[PDB]
Enzyme design. Structure first.
Site, short mmCIF file in Angstrom:
data_model
loop_
_atom_site.label_atom_id
_atom_site.label_comp_id
_atom_site.label_asym_id
_atom_site.label_seq_id
_atom_site.Cartn_x
_atom_site.Cartn_y
_atom_site.Cartn_z
N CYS A 145 0.82 -1.21 0.00
CA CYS A 145 0.00 0.00 0.00
C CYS A 145 0.86 1.27 0.00
N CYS B 47 -2.08 1.69 -2.51
CA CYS B 47 -3.11 2.71 -2.25
C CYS B 47 -2.55 4.13 -2.30
N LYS C 290 -1.16 5.38 -5.83
CA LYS C 290 -2.21 5.33 -6.84
C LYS C 290 -3.27 6.40 -6.59
N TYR D 81 -9.57 -3.93 -10.49
CA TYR D 81 -9.57 -2.54 -10.08
C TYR D 81 -8.20 -1.91 -10.28
N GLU E 247 -8.02 1.52 -12.46
CA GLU E 247 -7.56 2.74 -11.80
C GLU E 247 -6.34 3.32 -12.52
N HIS F 235 -28.12 19.16 2.97
CA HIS F 235 -28.25 19.81 1.66
C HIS F 235 -27.32 21.01 1.54
N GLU G 59 -26.92 12.86 0.33
CA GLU G 59 -28.30 12.98 0.83
C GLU G 59 -29.30 12.23 -0.05
C1 LIG Z 1 -27.97 32.42 2.71
C2 LIG Z 1 -28.67 31.16 3.13
C3 LIG Z 1 -28.04 29.93 2.95
C4 LIG Z 1 -28.66 28.73 3.32
N1 LIG Z 1 -27.99 27.54 3.12
C5 LIG Z 1 -28.60 26.41 3.48
C6 LIG Z 1 -27.90 25.15 3.26
O1 LIG Z 1 -26.79 25.02 2.74
N2 LIG Z 1 -28.63 24.03 3.66
C7 LIG Z 1 -29.90 24.04 4.23
O2 LIG Z 1 -30.41 22.95 4.55
N3 LIG Z 1 -30.54 25.23 4.44
C8 LIG Z 1 -29.91 26.36 4.08
N4 LIG Z 1 -30.55 27.56 4.27
C9 LIG Z 1 -31.90 27.53 4.88
C10 LIG Z 1 -33.00 27.25 3.87
O3 LIG Z 1 -32.92 28.22 2.83
C11 LIG Z 1 -34.36 27.35 4.57
O4 LIG Z 1 -34.35 26.54 5.75
C12 LIG Z 1 -35.55 26.95 3.69
O5 LIG Z 1 -35.53 27.66 2.45
C13 LIG Z 1 -36.86 27.22 4.41
O6 LIG Z 1 -37.95 26.76 3.58
P1 LIG Z 1 -39.42 27.31 3.79
O7 LIG Z 1 -40.30 26.47 2.86
O8 LIG Z 1 -39.69 27.29 5.29
O9 LIG Z 1 -39.37 28.82 3.28
P2 LIG Z 1 -38.84 29.54 1.96
O10 LIG Z 1 -37.92 28.64 1.21
O11 LIG Z 1 -38.24 30.85 2.43
O12 LIG Z 1 -40.16 29.78 1.10
C14 LIG Z 1 -41.21 30.67 1.54
C15 LIG Z 1 -41.75 31.38 0.31
O13 LIG Z 1 -43.04 31.98 0.59
C16 LIG Z 1 -43.04 33.30 0.08
N5 LIG Z 1 -44.05 34.09 0.80
C17 LIG Z 1 -43.89 34.76 1.99
N6 LIG Z 1 -44.97 35.38 2.41
C18 LIG Z 1 -45.91 35.11 1.42
C19 LIG Z 1 -47.26 35.49 1.27
N7 LIG Z 1 -47.93 36.24 2.15
N8 LIG Z 1 -47.92 35.04 0.17
C20 LIG Z 1 -47.25 34.28 -0.70
N9 LIG Z 1 -45.98 33.86 -0.66
C21 LIG Z 1 -45.36 34.32 0.43
C22 LIG Z 1 -41.60 33.77 0.24
O14 LIG Z 1 -41.33 34.89 -0.59
C23 LIG Z 1 -40.86 32.51 -0.22
O15 LIG Z 1 -40.79 32.43 -1.64
C24 LIG Z 1 -29.95 28.78 3.89
C25 LIG Z 1 -30.58 30.01 4.07
C26 LIG Z 1 -29.95 31.20 3.71
C27 LIG Z 1 -30.66 32.51 3.92
C1 LIG Z 2 -1.97 -1.19 -7.07
C2 LIG Z 2 -2.63 -1.51 -5.75
C3 LIG Z 2 -3.54 -0.61 -5.20
C4 LIG Z 2 -4.17 -0.87 -3.97
N1 LIG Z 2 -5.07 0.07 -3.46
C5 LIG Z 2 -5.65 -0.19 -2.31
C6 LIG Z 2 -6.57 0.80 -1.78
O1 LIG Z 2 -6.87 1.87 -2.31
N2 LIG Z 2 -7.14 0.44 -0.56
C7 LIG Z 2 -6.88 -0.74 0.16
O2 LIG Z 2 -7.46 -0.92 1.24
N3 LIG Z 2 -6.00 -1.66 -0.35
C8 LIG Z 2 -5.43 -1.39 -1.54
N4 LIG Z 2 -4.53 -2.31 -2.06
C9 LIG Z 2 -4.27 -3.55 -1.29
C10 LIG Z 2 -3.23 -3.36 -0.20
O3 LIG Z 2 -2.00 -2.95 -0.80
C11 LIG Z 2 -2.99 -4.70 0.51
O4 LIG Z 2 -4.24 -5.25 0.93
C12 LIG Z 2 -2.07 -4.58 1.73
O5 LIG Z 2 -0.84 -3.94 1.37
C13 LIG Z 2 -1.83 -5.95 2.34
O6 LIG Z 2 -0.98 -5.83 3.50
P1 LIG Z 2 -0.11 -7.06 3.97
O7 LIG Z 2 0.55 -6.70 5.31
O8 LIG Z 2 -0.95 -8.25 3.91
O9 LIG Z 2 1.08 -7.19 2.89
P2 LIG Z 2 2.12 -6.18 2.23
O10 LIG Z 2 1.68 -4.77 2.46
O11 LIG Z 2 2.28 -6.58 0.77
O12 LIG Z 2 3.48 -6.40 3.03
C14 LIG Z 2 4.22 -7.64 2.96
C15 LIG Z 2 5.68 -7.27 3.08
O13 LIG Z 2 6.48 -8.42 3.44
C16 LIG Z 2 7.62 -8.47 2.59
N5 LIG Z 2 8.10 -9.85 2.52
C17 LIG Z 2 7.66 -10.85 1.68
N6 LIG Z 2 8.28 -12.00 1.86
C18 LIG Z 2 9.18 -11.74 2.88
C19 LIG Z 2 10.12 -12.55 3.54
N7 LIG Z 2 10.32 -13.84 3.25
N8 LIG Z 2 10.87 -11.98 4.52
C20 LIG Z 2 10.67 -10.69 4.82
N9 LIG Z 2 9.80 -9.84 4.26
C21 LIG Z 2 9.08 -10.42 3.30
C22 LIG Z 2 7.13 -7.87 1.27
O14 LIG Z 2 8.19 -7.45 0.41
C23 LIG Z 2 6.30 -6.69 1.81
O15 LIG Z 2 7.09 -5.56 2.15
C24 LIG Z 2 -3.87 -2.07 -3.29
C25 LIG Z 2 -2.97 -2.97 -3.85
C26 LIG Z 2 -2.35 -2.71 -5.07
C27 LIG Z 2 -1.35 -3.69 -5.65
#
Ligand SMILES: Cc1cc2nc3c(=O)[nH]c(=O)nc-3n(C[C@H](O)[C@H](O)[C@H](O)COP(=O)(O)OP(=O)(O)OC[C@H]3O[C@@H](n4cnc5c(N)ncnc54)[C@H](O)[C@@H]3O)c2cc1C
Ligand SMILES: Cc1cc2nc3c(=O)[nH]c(=O)nc-3n(C[C@H](O)[C@H](O)[C@H](O)COP(=O)(O)OP(=O)(O)OC[C@H]3O[C@@H](n4cnc5c(N)ncnc54)[C@H](O)[C@@H]3O)c2cc1C
Ligand SMILES: O=C(NC(=S)N1CCOCC1)c1ccco1
Ligand SMILES: O=C(NC(=S)N1CCOCC1)c1ccco1
Ligand SMILES: O=C(NC(=S)N1CCOCC1)c1ccco1
Lengths: 588, 588
Positions: free
Chosen positions: B149, B154, B157, B291, B295, B566, B571
């Site tokens: 690895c 791992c 790569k 894989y 990869e 969100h 999600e």
């Molecule tokens: C800058 C910002 C970033 C945010 N980022 C996130 C985020 O990343 N993740 C997340 O989960 N939440 C986020 N939120 C929160 C999310 O926007 C609110 O929780 C969500 O939109 C609330 O939904 P609502 O249906 O209660 O109201 P709203 O989405 O506000 O909808 C109410 C609607 O009713 C309208 N309305 C109001 N009064 C009247 C009326 N008398 N007659 C008719 N229509 C009317 C309004 O104009 C509006 O269009 C963020 C909020 C802000 C301000």
């Molecule tokens: C290209 C590639 C990508 C991989 N990507 C991932 C990944 O993204 N995620 C993941 O979870 N796994 C990944 N793996 C798998 C991961 O590498 C192995 O599962 C892990 O290394 C196994 O660990 P190990 O201790 O069993 O053996 P190894 O890590 O192979 O170690 C054994 C060691 O013992 C030594 N040895 C051998 N014979 C002797 C001896 N007689 N005396 C002394 N030393 C000796 C070897 O030379 C080596 O250094 C990948 C493998 C490859 C080939």
């Protein structure tokens, strides 16, 4: 139990068919309603535990114990032969469409929760109207259908966050062997805004198409509830009229607050204006310390802006304060200035915005620090992010009788019902609930199913995961460390923690010990995981899957016995072992 | 029950103290031990729910029933007064070092599993040796401490995968407003390899420092087990000698296979050679469809290479085949060519590698398709990825009595024990176990705790999550859809699925319906989630957290009641509703 449910279900459903899966006579009725394009709910009794108790109770309405039985707005309509009689005599359409009200459901507000509620209700045959109107900001900004998240919230803010993240991708590419020179590349604000706004426009259109395809009536008009069943609407020509509805869902959301100081409304802006602003903000002051404040300051700085944040007291009040401090420290070390323990007193205008040449104006900000010392500095743009509030006095006649709390939000039962029995509230205006888009959607869809399809499932508001999309992201699920210690006492709390370094940061020569994670656990309950916290890249993707395990009551031993995926940031949760009580360093 | 655990614990622990948390005489002994720098395990009898019974069985060993009691390699040493007597008479050091053998533990193999086992054992006072030697590849490539690895797996790569992913970040950055022109940027292979190898070198050094700091003897020598307690070692000068150990852990891993065709060993390379190659491969043929094959082909194409993959039959045999086909389709649409149903017959050399000007050679590849048509094309580099195998005939004399299976892997009990009572095996050579770095680490650490600290916890090898780091990543946990149907029958299996589009792909104008996820569930067991599958960016971060929920037995209802974060890709798992049996389209 069964009788109060069946009564509630029949009284509330618009069109509902009681059926069984093996039923050939039921199949006959389903095919007739389909051909007639009559939408309806269906309750298959052979797939319910007390299906036999229910089948016999239906006769208190119909005087028959057999299946199929079809009802419309509380009234038994007939068995298979009778429904085909109405169908054959062309009497069926008039029967299913007879109602005391114009609509079965009126939704006030067309945002995250309201659109989800309205579309789901229409699937069960409820005749539905969705009302949406966007009151313009003080400088006149407005937008289309879909609510705060779609137009001026989660969607445009995360797109501008991605624009900022790509600045570090450009920096990193040189170390991984690509031939570019980051120092010679600049950013064009208006090109970004055009792309973001074109995506938002596709979502506005998609929602209108979706409502029409579900036979939902969309009215671009402001609604006012004047009596339990009457909604007064004012359209774009200020034409006023009244429509009536059986059930009402209030889903009107919130808008940004301004501080009561001279010049704030006149010369500042909010997040409502930022995401379509036609000029680059330039040198910017962000006033506030909420997740909105820090998210916006963060991407403006990564896009090359000169950005300052003015903080009255602490960052991210209500979040884990150890994590909040780490968030702020990363920002300060990567180009965001902070004016700490400071508030504004007045905003004065030095140059008007140049709308012809797409240039900001110039403003003088005067304020003072908490000891007494004075603040005075010039900025091209000033952004207020000091909280959000509902404005239900606009929407709700006090005579109707819907109770509000001291903040102006609606007091609801655990099934979203207000103090008026046919009126419900969802989303940000529902008092005490997490103010998040996926919460509003789940609440609206689940409520629609209870009203019109006889469902009983409630929305679960506990342990809802979050992510703050600051330059280095912060994900969380459950209690902060301080809330756990307060609830249970310090001797019943164990905290496992570790720094980590993303593999992607090694060749790029980024920091060794800034990313961080912890599990806050309860000793006397099998080391139950009360809270999970992570500061690092892709924090929302990391956190989401663990929210299912926490919902199911995961313990530290469940994290230990699960094997990691290598190489990832998330796997560090599977091998945590250093406790805070031990005093051993968490560094890598 | 209790007495079998106690005899096994006393017999194999190197130095162990039986204690209680409230015990001033126990503290007196504890303070002497690590003033003398004597490492040891400790068992606090008041923390165990049968400690009263354990304390009584100790008398079968010591003739006393009190705590503290100290043991060394199966021998009762004394109570408080006696240990202090040995200390002040300068007799203790010689007592704790008395052994029948040179070492308490000899680890053969210094990779993921072996380094983990050796470091953990030394923590409890086991005198430990770790042997590691790297047999050079046919062209002479070798590397330092840490295993497959760290050096040729791992770690390099995924770093080269990141360099490939940054090509799309450069493309995306223009759409988000940055001024660069992707078409004028090129990649420098040698710059990338230098950065990768400098990180690998820091890991080689870190492991040597870690073993020194834990008092582990590191021998850079090849080991051979010649009897149950004797290891013959050969050093870098071919000096041969013999060391003895109580417990032996085999952890020697695997190496790449070559096909038995002319020219393969002489003129091709494997992944062992790729990650330090001094020149860019150029136009490349990858033979294989594991894989590893996909990869490596994927990042070479993203770095600007002309790449072809030669596939004998199917992609990713043993993984869900609907997901494998989508992985391959994305690669083919994004610049990787495929020669399907095809195998190689001979490699002929047209140009020798130019080691002065640092350039590849040129090869002629001849092969044939399954219908008999011929394949013939020229390539600069040919990479073989046709599986990996152990070679324990090089490590293990046949007269020792360690049983191997038909593939040459070690047959083990569920506590890693071989057919020889003091010899254990971990990692890739343990027959039937997932061949992954975190599995090898957990097996090694948990085994050292059972041998030298009285632990009982076993490693759990079920539902271990995986990620394939192809250009579009593929994460999985649990059964493939076809394995679930084979085990339970089609009528007992329900599959929920959906396409999705990352928000980051909207403004970048990437594909609408390529990313995909599904949940494979069992109807008759409360819709239990048998397998989870996701194709999309950051798939390893997405998948990891859900592995905890699946380990705890998550159902579809658990996913439904958990609320999404969100905006994220992950999600989409919280709102799935389209089933495969409905025939409804999964597009969004
Ligand atoms: C800058 C910002 C970033 C945010 N980022 C996130 C985020 O990343 N993740 C997340 O989960 N939440 C986020 N939120 C929160 C999310 O926007 C609110 O929780 C969500 O939109 C609330 O939904 P609502 O249906 O209660 O109201 P709203 O989405 O506000 O909808 C109410 C609607 O009713 C309208 N309305 C109001 N009064 C009247 C009326 N008398 N007659 C008719 N229509 C009317 C309004 O104009 C509006 O269009 C963020 C909020 C802000 C301000
Ligand atoms: C290209 C590639 C990508 C991989 N990507 C991932 C990944 O993204 N995620 C993941 O979870 N796994 C990944 N793996 C798998 C991961 O590498 C192995 O599962 C892990 O290394 C196994 O660990 P190990 O201790 O069993 O053996 P190894 O890590 O192979 O170690 C054994 C060691 O013992 C030594 N040895 C051998 N014979 C002797 C001896 N007689 N005396 C002394 N030393 C000796 C070897 O030379 C080596 O250094 C990948 C493998 C490859 C080939
Ligand atoms: O007393 C007030 N607090 C003040 S001035 N500060 C706290 C924050 O840091 C700067 C100083 C107050 C009343 C109305 C608004 O502020
Ligand atoms: O909020 C209300 N709670 C109450 S008492 N209930 C719902 C109806 O009856 C069962 C309990 C409510 C009902 C009518 C108007 O407001
Ligand atoms: O039984 C096996 N090992 C040995 S030597 N023992 C375990 C039981 O207790 C007596 C000693 C074994 C290993 C692989 C398959 O069977």
């Amino acid at each position: 139990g069964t009788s109060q449910w069946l009564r509630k279900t029949v009284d509330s459903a618009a069109v509902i068919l009681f059926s069984k899966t093996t039923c050939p006579y039921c199949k006959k009725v389903k095919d007739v309603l389909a051909e007639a394009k009559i939408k309806h709910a269906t309750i298959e009794l052979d797939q319910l535990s007390n299906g036999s108790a229910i089948q016999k109770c239906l006769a208190s309405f119909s005087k028959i114990e057999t299946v199929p039985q079809m009802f419309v707005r509380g009234k038994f309509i007939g068995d298979s032969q009778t429904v085909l009689k109405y169908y054959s005599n062309d009497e069926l359409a008039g029967i299913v469409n007879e109602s005391k009200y114009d609509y079965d459901l009126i939704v006030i507000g067309g945002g995250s929760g309201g659109l989800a509620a309205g579309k789901e209700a229409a699937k069960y045959g409820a005749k539905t109207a969705v009302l949406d109107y966007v009151e313009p900001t003080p400088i006149g900004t407005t937008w289309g259908l879909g609510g705060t998240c779609v137009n001026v919230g989660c969607i445009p803010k995360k797109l501008m966050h991605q624009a900022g993240l790509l600045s570090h991708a450009l920096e990193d590419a040189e170390h991984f062997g690509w031939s570019l020179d980051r120092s010679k590349i600049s950013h064009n604000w208006s090109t970004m805004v055009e792309g973001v706004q074109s995506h938002i426009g596709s979502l506005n259109w998609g929602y209108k198409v979706a409502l029409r395809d579900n036979q939902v009536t969309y009215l671009n008009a402001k609604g006012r509830l004047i009596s339990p069943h009457e909604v007064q609407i004012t359209d774009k020509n200020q034409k006023v009229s009244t429509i009536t509805g059986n059930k009402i869902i209030l889903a009107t959301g919130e808008r940004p607050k301004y501080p009561e100081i001279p010049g704030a409304v006149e010369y500042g802006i909010t997040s409502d204006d930022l995401f379509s602003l036609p000029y680059f903000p330039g040198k910017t002051l962000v006033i506030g310390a909420s997740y909105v404040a820090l998210e916006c300051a963060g991407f403006l700085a990564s896009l090359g802006g000169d950005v300052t944040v003015m903080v009255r007291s602490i960052l991210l009040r209500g979040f884990d304060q150890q994590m909040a401090e780490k968030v702020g420290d990363y920002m300060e070390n990567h180009g965001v200035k902070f004016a700490k323990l400071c508030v504004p007193d007045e905003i004065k205008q030095l140059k008007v915005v140049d709308t012809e040449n797409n240039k900001p104006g110039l403003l003088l900000v005067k304020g003072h620090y908490t000891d007494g010392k004075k603040f005075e500095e010039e900025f091209e743009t000033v952004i207020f992010a000091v909280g959000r509030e509902p404005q239900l006095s606009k929407v709700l006649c006090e005579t109707v009788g819907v109770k509000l709390d001291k903040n102006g939000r609606v007091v609801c039962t655990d099934d979203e019902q207000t103090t008026v029995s046919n009126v419900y509230a969802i989303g940000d205006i529902n008092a005490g609930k997490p103010q998040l888009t996926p919460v509003a959607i789940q609440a609206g869809r689940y409520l629609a199913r209870r009203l019109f399809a006889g469902a009983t499932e409630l929305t679960d508001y506990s342990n809802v995961a979050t992510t703050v999309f600051t330059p280095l992201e912060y994900g969380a699920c459950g209690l902060s460390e301080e809330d756990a210690i307060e609830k249970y006492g310090d001797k019943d709390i164990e905290v496992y923690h570790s720094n980590f370094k993303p593999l992607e940061w090694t060749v790029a020569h980024r920091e060794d010990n800034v990313c961080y994670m912890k599990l806050v656990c309860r000793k006397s309950d099998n080391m139950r995981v009360l809270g999970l916290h992570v500061l690092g890249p892709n924090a929302g993707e990391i956190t989401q899957g663990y929210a299912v395990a926490i919902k199911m009551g995961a313990t530290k031993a469940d994290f230990d016995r699960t094997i990691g995926i290598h190489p990832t940031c998330s796997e560090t949760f599977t091998t945590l072992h250093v406790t805070k009580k031990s005093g051993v360093s968490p560094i890598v």
